[PDB]
Amino acid sequence: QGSPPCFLRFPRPVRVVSGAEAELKCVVLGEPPPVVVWEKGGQQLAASERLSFPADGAEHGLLLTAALPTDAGVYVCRARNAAGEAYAAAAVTVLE
């Protein structure tokens, strides 16, 4: 029968100096395990050399290898499975 996506750990905001690694962390549960996708400004993000999405079972991260001021803003985590969807937004603040 299954159960809809939910957050065991919610992605809290991160404040990071320009140039430092930043990671939004969450833990998403659900049956079947939800597919989690991160978007920014309404656009789905693509993995790259500077942006990765470490996923290990329920553990999910959005990882910025070296944050830049342009990385600041609100990111949306959307989790989906057969039973439903869960949404959580988190802000990255990048300081000089």
């Binding site: 809809p4 996506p5 939910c6 957050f7 919610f10 809290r12 905001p13 309404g42 609100v74 990111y75 949306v76 959307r78 039973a83 439903g84 969807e85 869960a86 949404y87 959580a88 937004a89 988190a90 802000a91």
Partner: protein, 98 residues
């Protein structure tokens, strides 16, 4: 220190298939801990409204769950916070597919 409430970040738009379960959650800060109000259509949402809406608040998180979503659930939802030092609000437009 007394600090007004702050809604951390909330999606602008979210979607859900009719008949499924939608969960949208949101962190906040404030001292003292703020009073949380979810509303749509200018009306406060109460826990177990229509037998389907649920709200889970803690001291730094609020979670809105809508079970068995119906078309008429769609709309612009507002999360409001208040404490003795100020208030905050943010909206999320909930779209039912389709």
């Amino acid at each position: 220190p007394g600090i007004p409430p702050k809604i951390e970040a909330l999606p602008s738009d979210i979607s859900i298939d009719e008949g499924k379960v939608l969960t949208v959650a949101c962190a906040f800060t404030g001292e003292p801990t703020p009073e949380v109000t979810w509303s749509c259509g200018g009306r406060k949402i109460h826990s177990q409204e229509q037998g389907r809406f649920h709200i889970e608040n803690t001291d730094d998180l609020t979670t809105l769950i809508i079970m068995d979503v119906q078309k008429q659930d769609g709309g612009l939802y507002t999360l409001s916070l208040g404490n003795e030092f100020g208030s905050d609000s943010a909206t999320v437009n909930i779209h039912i597919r389709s």
